[PDB]
Design an enzyme around this catalytic site. Structure first.
Site, short mmCIF file in Angstrom:
data_model
loop_
_atom_site.label_atom_id
_atom_site.label_comp_id
_atom_site.label_asym_id
_atom_site.label_seq_id
_atom_site.Cartn_x
_atom_site.Cartn_y
_atom_site.Cartn_z
N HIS A 115 -39.06 -85.49 -36.10
CA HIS A 115 -38.48 -84.56 -34.96
C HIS A 115 -38.14 -85.21 -33.68
CE1 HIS A 115 -38.09 -80.72 -32.32
NE2 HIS A 115 -39.26 -81.13 -31.58
N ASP A 152 -48.13 -81.09 -27.44
CA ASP A 152 -46.69 -80.52 -27.14
C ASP A 152 -46.36 -80.50 -25.32
OD1 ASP A 152 -44.61 -78.75 -26.84
OD2 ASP A 152 -45.20 -77.68 -28.99
#
Ligand code: HEM
Ligand code: HEM
Ligand code: HEM
Ligand code: HEM
Ligand code: MG
Lengths: 306, 305, 306, 305, 306, 306
Positions: free
Chosen positions: C219, C146
Site C-alpha cells: 500500500h 494510521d
C-alpha cells in the site's frame, strides 16, 4: 491491622532499584536511616501530589537481618538459592539492603534515592543501581505486555502479605530480585508467531494462547503453579526495562513479592531446572540473569519503632 | 523555503544526549541514517500522540562535516575552542554527531535512540550517552529554576536560526554541549542567600536580584551580553540534570543553541576567563566541565537529501 | 486575506461524517444553513473549551455547486470518477453536502450534527452517517498505525490549500471520501510478516520496510507518488475506524484532503488499476469501497458571505 | 464471594450487547463465560488506569434453564410486560447481556469484538447500542442523569444479593429498556414545564420542593419507600445513544437491584400509575422498544465452570 | 508586529483585576516597575509551565499617561466618559494603572500581584481589587455562556491591536473596565424564556435567537454594531464572575479590549442611552455598574525600553 | 455501620469556609437545611464528576447544639476555650455553624455556598467567609510545604473519627478553626536558615531538621505530642492560604479535625502557653489569630434524619 509498606503500589512508570551491602561498623547508621525512611518518602513526595505516586519499599537480607536486629527472624528469610540448571543458571549476588523506589517520574525517584544514600554515605557499598522505565503501553523490553495477570485488590493482599502464619511479621513480604539482560538480536530474529510461543500470549492483543496450543515450555505455562489447596499460587511482579544504547544493554529488572519465598522459588525451579515435560523456560534462551538476591520487606510500623 | 529541525521544542521532561564519532569507512552508513532520521522520529513518535512530544535534533561536527559533504560549509562551524582560564578550564572532547532526543517520557527517547544506534552499529563509536530528567518544578541539580529567561516565539526564531547571513544553511542552528559535574557537598554547604549570590536570582521565587545587589561574578551577570547595538544577545538552553546515586555523580548537561557560535563562545569566555571586574563565574566553583563539543544542526530538508 | 475551514485540525478522537443530498426546492434552506454553520460550531463548541477541539468542515459536490451558486466554479471540482479495475472497483455514490465533524468527544460531534440536520430537515436526504472513533494508539481496524506520514505545519498548508493557481477559491481544499469495509477473518488469517508486506511497514513498531524488501504492490509503495518536480506529492488523511460487532462491520472511513483532486485521484488509479509492476494494491484484497464522493471545502469567509 | 463490576466508576462510553442462544450453542456459551473475566483483563490492562474497562455479564430466565441445572436465583423470571391504559412496557428477547463500559469507546469495541468472536455461530444478535455521555452527565432530554444514585455502602446494600438468597450472593438483577424520545414534542414545552415532568431543575439539577413537585413527575413516581420506612433504591447508568440521520434520539436504561421487585415496583408506578397520577409524564415523550431482565452472577460463579 | 502584551490570552479560569492610583512622588517607583513587569511575569509563571498560562496585561490611564511620560500620547486615550442615561448611569471612577492578571489557577495570579504591589508599596493607593473565577462551563453569574462570539485568530489581531493608524503605538490596545453587581433575586424571578429575551441567545444551548424573534432591546442586539463597510465592529471580552456569599454580592467584572475606544464607547452609548428603537439594554435592569475606567495597554517593547 | 461526612477529602485546591450564627427564631430553618445539605452537595457536584471533588463538611457549635437538638450531646463539645498566654492570645469568636466547602475549583465551592445561604438567608448572620486557594506546590503563605505529616488511610480514620468511646455519635469529628494573619514583612526579614528554625523543617526540600538541631520552640517541636500510651497523637489539617494584596492581608486559615478536642487543645496550649523548655511557638511571632471556634461535625446519617 499493622500498616504494610507500599508493596501494592499503583501503576508507576519509573523506578530506581538500589541494592547495597552494609560495611563494617555501618549497622548504627543504617538503623537510623531505617527509622526515618517513611518520613523521607513523605518529604520528597508530598509536595508532588497527587500525580507523583512516589513510594519506596525497603528490604533487608538474611545475613543483614542478624547484624541489625535480634529477636526472632521472619520464618522464610534465607539467602537466595543458586539454581544450577542443565543449561541456564540463576545466580546469587550480594545484597544486604534493597530500596525499591517507584513514581510517575524518574526525577522523584532520584530525589529520594539521593536523600537515602546521603544518610548512608560511609556505611554502605553500592552493589547495583538501576533506573527503570515502563514502555508507553505497559510493554517490556521483549515487546510484550507485562503485568496483565498480576493479582489485584483482596487477592493481592492474600498473596503478598505475611499474615497469621508468622504473626510477629504480619504486613511484611518477601522480595526476590534478578537483573536480566536480553539478547535482542536473537529475539528480533523470531517471527511474532514464534515469540508468542515463547511467552504464551499474543503479542499485539495480549490474549492468552488457548491450552490446546500453548507450549509446555512457554513462560506462562511454567510460571502457572497450583497449590495443595487447588488454588493457583500468585506473586506480585513489577518488571521494569532498563538499558544503555551505547553499551548495547537491553534488560528487564525482575522483582516479585510473595507472602512466602516458597512460591517465588518454585517458579524459579520450574524455569531453570525444568519439569516432567519442559527442559526449561524458553524465555531464558533470550535472557541471562546476572544478579539474584532475596529480601524481607517488613511492615512499615516495624521500621518506625527504632 | 525551509523547515528547521525541532530546535524550538515544547518543555519536555526527559532527554537522551548521544554523542558519537564516525569510524573510518562509516561515512556511507551515516549518510543513509541522516536521510531517514526524520522518518524514524515519526515512526516511534506518531503513535504516542499527543502526550509524547518526541523530537530528535541531529547535529554534525566541524571535522565530520568535511568527511561527509563537499560544497560550502556553514560559516560558523569549527571545533570547540578549549578555554584555559586562570582557574577553570573548558575542555574540548571528540564528537562527530549529536542526537538531542527529547520527549515527555524517557522510554520514547530510548526507543528512538535504539533505532538510530541500530542503523549505525558498525559505523560509529559512542563517546557519551546521558539520560536526563527535569525535576518536578523546572529545577536543576543545584535546586534553582532553570530556563526562565530563555527567549520564546519570534524572539527565539530570531536568536537561534541561521538566516540570510548564510542563506545556503538558513534553518540551521549551532549547538554547544558541555557535560558538567557538580560538587554537591560544597554547594549544600552554602546558605540559600549565598547560593542566590552565585546564581543572581532568588532560589524559591526565581525573581532576579536587583542590579544594585546582584554580584558581577554571579552567573546571570556574566551570561548577560549586549551586542554592539545595545540589544541583548540571547541563546536557547535546555539544561538537564542527570546522575547516579551509587557513584555520587550529580550533573547538569548543558546545551545551548544560537544562530552563530560567536554568541555562545562569548558567554563562555566571560564565564571561564573573567572580565574587567570578575575573576570568573562563581558557578564554576561548584561545576566542572568534562566535555565540550560544537555542532551544526542543519535545516530538516538538508537531511531529507 | 482568506481564513480556511479547519481542514488542518489537531488529532481528535471522535468524528461524525454526514453525507446528504439536496432535495428539489431545498437550495434555499441549505444556503441559509451554510452561512450559519460557523456560528453553530461556536455555539456548541465554545462552552466545552479548550479540551473540546470541535470543528466542522463543510464540503459541496460538483452538481450541487451548480444548483447553489452561479459564478465561477473551483477549477478541480467534478463528480467522483468511478474506477473499474480488472479486479477491484472504486464506486461513485451520491452526495451533495459533506459535514466532517471532529472533536475529542463524540457528544460534541453529535450535538453539532443535531443542530445542523435540525435546520436542514425538509431540504435534504441523509445518504451516509458514520460515527468514528480512534483505536488505541492511532491504530486502524487492520491493527496498523494510521496517519504516520501525513504532512504537518507548513508542508500541510502547501499540500492541502488552494492558492494562486485558482485565486478566487484560495483557502479551499478538495475532499474525497470512501467508506471501506474490511474482511477481518481473511486478514487475521495472515501472519504478521505477511500483513506487513501488504502495508509496507512494521506492525508493532511502525517503521517503514526498506526498499530492499518493500513489495511494489504494498500500500505504501502504491500511494507514494513523485511529481514531475521530483518532489513527492502529499495529501492529508484522517481515516477513522467505525464498526458494529453485531453486524460484523469493521470499517475504515477514508477522507483525504488535497489542493487539487489530481493528486488524490492518481493514488487511487495506482491502487485500483495498478502499475507496470503491480496488479493492484494488496490492501484492496481485504477492503471493499462502498461509497465514493468528491467535495470542495471552501474557505470559511466564502460561506460567511451568503 | 467476589461480585462482577456492577458498581463501576463513572465511565463515558458503553456498548450494550443483547443476544439469544441458538439451539446447540449452550456449550460455546458456557466456555466463553468462564473466560470473559480474563478477556476483560487482556484488553483493558494495557490502557490502565484511565481505561476503566469493565464487562458485566447477565443471563436471562429461559437461558439460565438451558445452561445450568439445580437451583435458580430466587427472583429470576422473564421481564413482565406492562399494559397500561396509555403506555406499554414491552418484553423483547434476550438470553445474554454484555454491559461493557470504559472511558473510551474503542476499549468497549475491542472487548465486544473478542467476545462475539468466540460466540460467532452459537448466538444471534438482538440489540447493540453504542452509548456516550453528553456534556456534563446530561441525557437526551437535557437533564442531569445519575444524581440521586446510591454510592459506596448504600449501593452495595441496594444492588447485591445477600443472605436472602445465599447460594447466589454477589449477584444482581439488571433490567434493560431501550427508550426513544419524541424530541420535537419535548422541545415544544417551556423549561418550567419540562421541570414539572422530571421533578428537578434543568440547569442547576436541584430537586423541586415537595410543595411544588407534581405527583406525576418522574422523580415522584420512582421514589418508593418500604414498609420499614426506608428508601428502596436501584443503581442506574443510563446512556444516551442515537443517529441524527434517522432522527433517532435515545436513552438506554439499565437498572441494577438486589431483587427485581424494587425495579418492578418503580416500573408499575410509571406505566400503570397511582392513586393520584395516571402515569409517569416522562413516558409521554419516551417509548420503550426493548425490555429484558437478567441475573448477573458473582464473579466466582462464572470462573468455576 | 512589535511584540504586544498578552491581550490575546487563551481561556483561563482565574483572574485578579488590580486598579490603583499613583500617589504624589510615586512616578519613579512606577516607571521602574513597568520596565520589570514582563520579567516578573516570567519569574512567577515559568516554573508552573505549561499548565500555568499566567499573563499580566498592564494598562495606563489618560491623566497618569501625562504624569509618567512626555512625548506623544496614544490617539484614543482619554478619561472614561460618564454616561448619564434616562434610567441607567455608567459611572467613571479613578484609576491610573490596571493590572489584568490571568492564569489557570488563582494562586499564580496572587503571587504575581503580590510581587507587583510589593514593588509599589509607598507609591500607589489601591482603588479596586477583584478575584474572579470562571464558572465551570464558561458561564457567567446570570447563568449564560459568556465569550462565545469573541473574535479569534487574525480577526482578533485586527480588532484589538493598534496598527498604522497610530504607528508610534502599534501593538497597543485600549481596555475598558466596569465592575457590575447583579440583582440575582430579580433575575431568578424570570422564566428562562424571558431571560433569553434579555440576552438574545438560548440559555442552555447557547444558540442565537433568530433575527425575526430577537428583541431590539436585547443585549446581543444592542452590542452588535456595523461599521461603514457593513462589516461588524468587534471587541475582545473576558468577563469574570466574582462575589461574596456572606454579603450577597454576585458580580460580573467586564473587560473589553479594542484597537480604538470609539467602538467600545459606541456599544456603551447604545446600552445606557438607548436608540430610536430601544430604551436601553435590558441587561442593565439586572446589572449596576459601580466602576468605570479606560486604559491604554502599550506594546510590551514600550515598557521594556524605559 | 455509620457513614461519616467527607472529613477525609482528597487533595483539593480550593475552599470556602463559611461561619454563621443562628438568629433567634432561625432554628427551624436551620434544621431543615441540615437535612438537605447532603443532597445540595450532590445537585451542584454531580455534573462536575469526576474532576470536581466537591465536598461539604457541616459543623455545629456548642451553644447551637443546645438550641437545635432533642437529646444527648457529643461528649467533647464545648465552647472554644480562650488561651491567655503571657505573650500571645488565642481568641474565641462566635460561630454556630461551619461549612467547610472544598473542591478542585473555586466556582463549585461558590455555587454550593450560594445554594446553602440561599436557604438560610433570614435565619442566620455571617461571621466569617474565606476563599482559600492552595499554592502550586502545597505551600502556605510563609512559603513552607504544609500538609506533609498529616496521617493517611487507616491512621487517619483512627485519629479523626469518633468511635465506640461515644457510640451515639461515631462517624463524627471535632473541628477547630482559627483564622491567622501573618506579618509577611517581618517574616521575609529572616534568612531562610532562621525561618527553618522557626518551623522545624527545611524550606525547599521539606526534610525534617534532625533532633539535635531542631529548636524546642520550633512549630514542629511543640505540635509533636505523645499520649500517655507512648503513641503519637495526630490531627488532620487542611490549612488554606487566603488574602488580599490591596489590603496587605496574607493569611493561613487553620482547620484541624480530631476524634476528641483534647488533642487539638493540647497542641494549642503548648503553642500559646509554652512548655518546660519553650516560652511559646515561634510561629506566633509572625502569625496572629483573629478567630477561634470549635464545632462537632456529625455523621452523615445524623443530619439526613431531621
Ligand atoms: C526475564 C524477564 C521476564 C520477562 C521479560 C517476563 C515477562 C512476562 C510476560 C510478558 C508475562 C505475560 C503477561 C503477564 O501476565 O505479566 C509474564 C507472566 C508471568 N511471569 Fe514473567 N517475565 C520474566 C521473568 C519472570 C520470573 C523470573 C518469574 C518468576 C520468578 C516470572 C513470573 C511470571 C508469572 C507468575 C506470570 C503470569 C502467570 C499466569 O499467567 O497465571 N516472570 N512475564
Ligand atoms: C554549569 C551548569 C549550568 C547551570 C546549572 C546553569 C543554570 C542556570 C540557572 C539556574 C539560570 C537562571 C534561570 C534561567 O534564566 O535559565 C541560568 C541562566 C542563564 N544561563 Fe546558565 N547554567 C549553566 C551553564 C551555563 C552556560 C555554560 C552558559 C553559556 C554558555 C549558560 C547561559 C545562561 C544564560 C544566557 C542565562 C540567562 C541571561 C539572562 O538572564 O538574561 N549557562 N543558568
Ligand atoms: C426513559 C428515560 C429515562 C430518563 C431520561 C430518566 C431520567 C432521569 C433523571 C433526569 C432523573 C433525576 C436525576 C437522577 O436522580 O438521576 C431520574 C431519576 C430517577 N430515575 Fe429515571 N429516567 C428514565 C427512566 C427510568 C426508569 C425506567 C426507571 C426505573 C425503573 C427510572 C428510575 C429512576 C430513579 C429511581 C430515580 C431517582 C429517584 C430519587 O430522586 O430519589 N428511570 N431519571
Ligand atoms: C454585566 C455585564 C455583562 C454581562 C453579564 C454580559 C454577558 C454577555 C453574554 C451572555 C453575551 C452572549 C454570549 C457572547 O457572545 O459572549 C454577551 C455578548 C456580547 N457582550 Fe456582553 N455582557 C456584559 C457587558 C457587556 C458590555 C458592558 C459590553 C460592551 C461594552 C458587552 C459586549 C458584548 C458583545 C459585543 C457581545 C456579542 C456581539 C455579537 O453578538 O456578534 N458586554 N455578553
Ligand atoms: Mg419527530
Amino acid at each position: 491491622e499493622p500498616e504494610p509498606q507500599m508493596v501494592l503500589s499503583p501503576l508507576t512508570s519509573a523506578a530506581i532499584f538500589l541494592v547495597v551491602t552494609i560495611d563494617s561498623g555501618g549497622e548504627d547508621t543504617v538503623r537510623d536511616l531505617l527509622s526515618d525512611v517513611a518520613s523521607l518518602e513523605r518529604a520528597v513526595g508530598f509536595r508532588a501530589q497527587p500525580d507523583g505516586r512516589l513510594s519506596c519499599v525497603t528490604g533487608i537480607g538474611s545475613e543483614a537481618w542478624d547484624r541489625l536486629f535480634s529477636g526472632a527472624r521472619p520464618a522464610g528469610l534465607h539467602p537466595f538459592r543458586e539454581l544450577d540448571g542443565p543449561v541456564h543458571r540463576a545466580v546469587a549476588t550480594p545484597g544486604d539492603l534493597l530500596f525499591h523506589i517507584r513514581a510517575s517520574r524518574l526525577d522523584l525517584c532520584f530525589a529520594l534515592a539521593t536523600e537515602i544514600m546521603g544518610r548512608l554515605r560511609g556505611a554502605v557499598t553500592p552493589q547495583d543501581e538501576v533506573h527503570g522505565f515502563k514502555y508507553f503501553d505497559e510493554r517490556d523490553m521483549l515487546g510484550f505486555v507485562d503485568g496483565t495477570e498480576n493479582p489485584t485488590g483482596a487477592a493481592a493482599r492474600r498473596a503478598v502479605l505475611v499474615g497469621a502464619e508468622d504473626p510477629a511479621f504480619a504486613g511484611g513480604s518477601y522480595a526476590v530480585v534478578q537483573k536480566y539482560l536480553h539478547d535482542i538480536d536473537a529475539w528480533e530474529g523470531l517471527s511474532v508467531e514464534a515469540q508468542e510461543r515463547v511467552i504464551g500470549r499474543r503479542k499485539m492483543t495480549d490474549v492468552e494462547l488457548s491450552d490446546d496450543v500453548k507450549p509446555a515450555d512457554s513462560h506462562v505455562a511454567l510460571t502457572s503453579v497450583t497449590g495443595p489447596d487447588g488454588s493457583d499460587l500468585e506473586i506480585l511482579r513489577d518488571n521494569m526495562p532498563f538499558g544503555s544504547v551505547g553499551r548495547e544493554e537491553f534488560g528487564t529488572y525482575f522483582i516479585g513479592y510473595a507472602r512466602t519465598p516458597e512460591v517465588t522459588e518454585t517458579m524459579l525451579e520450574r524455569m531453570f531446572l525444568g519439569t516432567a515435560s519442559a527442559p526449561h523456560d524458553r524465555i531464558l534462551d533470550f535472557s541471562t540473569a546476572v544478579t539474584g538476591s532475596l529480601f524481607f520487606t517488613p511492615a512499615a510500623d516495624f521500621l518506625e519503632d527504632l
